[PDB]
Amino acid sequence: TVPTEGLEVTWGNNEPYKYWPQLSTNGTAHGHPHEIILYYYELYPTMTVVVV
Amino acid sequence: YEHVTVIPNTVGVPYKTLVNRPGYSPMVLEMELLSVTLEPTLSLDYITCEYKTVIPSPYVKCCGTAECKDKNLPDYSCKVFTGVYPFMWGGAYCFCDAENTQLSEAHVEKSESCKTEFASAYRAHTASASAKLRVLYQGNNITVTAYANGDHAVTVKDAKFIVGPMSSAWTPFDNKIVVYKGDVYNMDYPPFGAGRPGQFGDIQSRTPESKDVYANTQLVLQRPAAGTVHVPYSQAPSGFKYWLKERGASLQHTAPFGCQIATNPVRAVNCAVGNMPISIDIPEAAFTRVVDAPSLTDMSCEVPACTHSSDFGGVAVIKYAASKKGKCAVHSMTNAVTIREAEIEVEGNSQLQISFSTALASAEFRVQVCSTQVHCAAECHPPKDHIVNYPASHTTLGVQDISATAMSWVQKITGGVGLVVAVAALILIVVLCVSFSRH
Numbered sequence A: 001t002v003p004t005e006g007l008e009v010t011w012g013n014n015e016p017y018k019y020w021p022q023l024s025t026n027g028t029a030h031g032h033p034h035e036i037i038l039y040y041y042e043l044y045p046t047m048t049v050v051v052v
Numbered sequence B: 001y002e003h004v005t006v007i008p009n010t011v012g013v014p015y016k017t018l019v020n021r022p023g024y025s026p027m028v029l030e031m032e033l034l035s036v037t038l039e040p041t042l043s044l045d046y047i048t049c050e051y052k053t054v055i056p057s058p059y060v061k062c063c064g065t066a067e068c069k070d071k072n073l074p075d076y077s078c079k080v081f082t083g084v085y086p087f088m089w090g091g092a093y094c095f096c097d098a099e100n101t102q103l104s105e106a107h108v109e110k111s112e113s114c115k116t117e118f119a120s121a122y123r124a125h126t127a128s129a130s131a132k133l134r135v136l137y138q139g140n141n142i143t144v145t146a147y148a149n150g151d152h153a154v155t156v157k158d159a160k161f162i163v164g165p166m167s168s169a170w171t172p173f174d175n176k177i178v179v180y181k182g183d184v185y186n187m188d189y190p191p192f193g194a195g196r197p198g199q200f201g202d203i204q205s206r207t208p209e210s211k212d213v214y215a216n217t218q219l220v221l222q223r224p225a226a227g228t229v230h231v232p233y234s235q236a237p238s239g240f241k242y243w244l245k246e247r248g249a250s251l252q253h254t255a256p257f258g259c260q261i262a263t264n265p266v267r268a269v270n271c272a273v274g275n276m277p278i279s280i281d282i283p284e285a286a287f288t289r290v291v292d293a294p295s296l297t298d299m300s301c302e303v304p305a306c307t308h309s310s311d312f313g314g315v316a317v318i319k320y321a322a323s324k325k326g327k328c329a330v331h332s333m334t335n336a337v338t339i340r341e342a343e344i345e346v347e348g349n350s351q352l353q354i355s356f357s358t359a360l361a362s363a364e365f366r367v368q369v370c371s372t373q374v375h376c377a378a379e380c381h382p383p384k385d386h387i388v389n390y391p392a393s394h395t396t397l398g399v400q401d402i403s404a405t406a407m408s409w410v411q412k413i414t415g416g417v418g419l420v421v422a423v424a425a426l427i428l429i430v431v432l433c434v435s436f437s438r439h
């Protein structure tokens, strides 16, 4: 699982790998209200819910 | 000119700043941290090492009693056993088969290997900060190394940079550190003079060359089995050896905040906590007068494409009209949008192109080039590759910013509710007041 701050992974004696998430979503912005709520929900799973 | 800015301690991320000196063309500097180091001051308490048990030949005295006296060795005992009748390869040890005694003794001392294989127990207190900084000054990129205490100032092309002092002092190293050959482990060393048998601390010495060794290894001598000369002993196994096998994981692999811990000297590299303030003094000579510099007029902005991705997402085309051919400076005036290109070249009437990376869904950014401000607006669509291997370059986003089509729907709904409340309130106000007039 990848944290929003990024994840570091070390495999054996190899140099460590670093990963970061992007703000990807299956929702849309600038569209219909039911498409916009999904856009923000997926990107911000906690606050979107609290604010709404 | 005195200029002060603050840059986050995240390594490998460029941040940019604008120097405002009215009457002169604006200067833009780009600075990036290449490395940040925290170097703690350590004080050695003691060294833990492997011990060896020394057992000198036994003394065999037949037809008589042997005796031994106390010695001042680190861990020593002696015992005399009676009724011993040992044999040699060629027959019984001696003529006498009665009233025989044997003296056995043993002691513990540091092995010769303690000059190569050892763990040092240190106390930690405070740490000095330093950093490797790369600053783009007028189109040259110069690299400067400075302490971040706030006490070192470095000279780049006749300009003064005084890095520091760091905002927060979280240090990965804890209060007590045990350092083996290559890695630092946070642990609570047992205090000097109190090591329990069989764990870290069975044999402890104050300095590598010191001759005072305190060892509590439980050596108890035992009776020689009949028919032989062996001097049997029972001892807990070496403490250091057991720690080496069951070490756990060193701080380098388990520290918080992405630190890398390296040794000789013990140091922490690239920890991402806090903001390091940078203050720059720029000599008056470098600044260039407004009249000499190119001046830009008639600017309009159209954003062909926007994608909110960590890498530089969108291109913006800006149309400029310029007095003369010269270098010019570009800087965003809103925090969210960051513009990759510091300087672009302008001539005649043409289009300049700047690349922007942002995390804002609908973007409203004012970009200023050579003292004129042009406003650019666009709609951004989300990125479709889920995980990337490079650090995020856009700054973070806050609840203030919601997308434009989002705002409109919020305003309308909230407004509709508000009107209903207001109409209702007016009705109450009227009825209540009329009732007061009525008697």
Ligand SMILES: *[C@H]1O[C@H](CO[C@@H]2O[C@@H](C)[C@@H](O)[C@@H](O)[C@@H]2O)[C@@H](O[C@H]2O[C@H](CO)[C@@H](O[C@H]3O[C@H](CO[C@@H]4O[C@H](CO)[C@@H](O)[C@H](O)[C@@H]4O)[C@@H](O)[C@H](O[C@H]4O[C@H](CO)[C@@H](O)[C@H](O)[C@@H]4O)[C@@H]3O)[C@H](O)[C@H]2NC(C)=O)[C@H](O)[C@H]1NC(C)=O
Residues within 6 Å of the ligand: B136, B139, B141
């Ligand atoms: C002073 O330094 C600027 C940045 O300094 C860089 O890092 C410093 C710590 C130091 O090491 C310094 O020496 C480095 O130059 C520098 O501006 C530059 O910034 C870019 C990095 O941000 C840099 O790199 C790119 O350019 C290539 C095209 O050139 C290729 O480079 C490859 C190695 O990366 C070679 O193998 C090729 O033969 C070829 O020369 C792009 O293609 C790169 O993107 C692609 O590369 C990455 C891996 O690096 C891959 O994953 C992908 O294919 C990716 O798409 C990358 O963008 C540029 O050299 C340069 N960019 C400019 C000109 O804006 C300047 O030299 C200087 N300051 C300025 C701004 O003048």
Ligand SMILES: CC(C)CCC[C@@H](C)[C@H]1CC[C@H]2[C@@H]3CC=C4C[C@@H](O)CC[C@]4(C)[C@H]3CC[C@]12C
Residues within 6 Å of the ligand: A033, A034, A036, A037, A040, A041, A044, A047, A048, A049, A051, A052, B397, B398, B399, B400, B401, B402, B403, B406, B407, B409, B410
């Ligand atoms: C159109 C109707 C259904 C109302 C829609 C409300 C939407 C547009 C509002 C309500 C909740 C809001 C979100 C609440 C919390 C956050 C997390 C913050 O870090 C970024 C802003 C963000 C993501 C807000 C974005 C816009 C938002 C999703």
